[PDB]
Design a protein around this ligand. Structure first.
Ligand SMILES: COc1ccc(C2=NCC[C@H]3SCC[C@H]23)cc1
Ligand SMILES: [Cl-]
Ligand SMILES: [Cl-]
Ligand SMILES: [Cl-]
Ligand SMILES: [Cl-]
Ligand SMILES: [Mn+2]
Length: 340
């Protein structure tokens, strides 16, 4: 039967089932006030699916110049055509190759660039902004979004949305690397999975995806979304409570020292955005510092709500298109204040 919601992460994560229900705030707001992330499923069924295909992005924008990152080693590939990224999104035999002759796992850096999403893609902007869940929080002018209402004493978010495009990580060695490294934002954000590309050529790659989710510490109910409902998994997230940020900084200073980095005792490993917490570092964070996170698998059409100040990292299981919007909820406005 259809239900308002369910629980993931053994009861620690709210999952709302109906992205447009006017009642969602009645369940959403107690979880949000406690500093928890929230998941909303089914946003893909509200969107115009033809606007979110990699082939259309290549056809319409393919001649623009961009940089890419190699996700395996962080090397920058400077000044290539955006079609060189899109045409390899799902077809492995079209991907740029590293010197070892392997196809590369690539991330498209800063595209569309800065605040230009709305100007470059006005029909995509309309389709997304009209279908965001919890609209009193997430719309630029929503009644519970203080972004446009705050003085300079607060760090205000840039005009969004922002698009995040990257290939899926593939091998056993790829399990220890991030698509986006551990970091925190001073605003709240909603991140929507608008497209998941399951590739072909090296197509039969279903089992390393399961071992990644398993080793990622995903709950049994999350694993049933694959096996029972056949939904498409895009990305594995780890998110940590804002209150646990300094304990995470202490772990990464200790590990940085063990690994022979030479770092002043006050430097900020989270702001550096240079770490991915693999199975080993997550277990150590738990055992030695008493810190537990939320392991979240974001499927096609899932919206992930990330609280201000919450450290988080992202690991693409397949090729993903994500679109994110920043907002300032009254619950978390303390995290963007410029004094004390
Ligand atoms: C947050 O409050 C909510 C209230 C009701 C819903 C429903 N959406 C479509 C189908 C029905 S059947 C049972 C309740 C369902 C969802 C959320
Ligand atoms: Cl908080
Ligand atoms: Cl458009
Ligand atoms: Cl709302
Ligand atoms: Cl990163
Ligand atoms: Mn972020």
């Amino acid at each position: 039967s259809m239900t308002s919601h369910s629980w993931l992460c053994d009861g620690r994560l709210l999952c709302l089932h109906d992205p447009s229900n006017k009642n969602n705030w009645k369940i959403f707001r107690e979880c949000w006030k406690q500093g928890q992330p929230v998941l909303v499923s089914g946003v893909h069924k509200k969107l115009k699916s033809e606007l979110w295909k990699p082939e259309a992005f290549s056809q319409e924008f393919g001649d623009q110049d961009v940089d890419l990152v190699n996700c395996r080693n962080c090397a920058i590939i400077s000044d290539v055509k955006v079609r060189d990224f899109w045409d390899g999104f799902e077809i492995i035999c079209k991907r740029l190759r590293s010197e070892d002759g392997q196809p590369m796992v690539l991330k498209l850096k800063d595209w569309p660039p800065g605040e230009d999403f709305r100007d470059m893609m006005p029909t995509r902007f309309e389709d997304l902004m009209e279908n965001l869940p919890l609209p009193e929080y997430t719309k630029r002018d929503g009644r519970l979004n203080l972004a446009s209402r705050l003085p300079s004493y607060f760090v205000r978010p840039d005009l969004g949305p922002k698009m995040y495009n990257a290939y899926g990580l593939i091998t056993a060695e790829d399990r220890r690397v991030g698509t986006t490294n551990l970091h925190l934002d001073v605003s709240d954000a909603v991140n929507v999975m608008v497209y998941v590309g399951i590739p072909i050529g090296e197509g039969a790659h279903d089992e390393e995806v399961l071992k990644t989710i398993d080793e990622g510490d995903a709950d049994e109910v999350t694993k049933e979304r694959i096996h029972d409902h056949k939904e498409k998994p895009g990305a594995l997230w780890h998110i940590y409570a804002a209150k646990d940020a300094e304990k995470i900084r202490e772990l990464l200073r200790k590990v940085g020292e063990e690994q022979g980095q030479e770092n002043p005792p006050d430097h900020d490993p989270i702001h550096d955005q240079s770490w991915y917490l693999d199975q080993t570092l997550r277990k150590r964070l738990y055992e030695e510092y008493g810190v537990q996170g939320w392991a979240i698998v974001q499927f096609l059409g899932d919206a992930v709500f990330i609280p201000a100040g919450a450290p988080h990292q992202v690991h693409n299981l397949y090729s993903c298109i994500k679109v994110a919007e920043d907002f300032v909820s009254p619950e978390h406005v303390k995290h963007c204040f410029r004094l004390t």
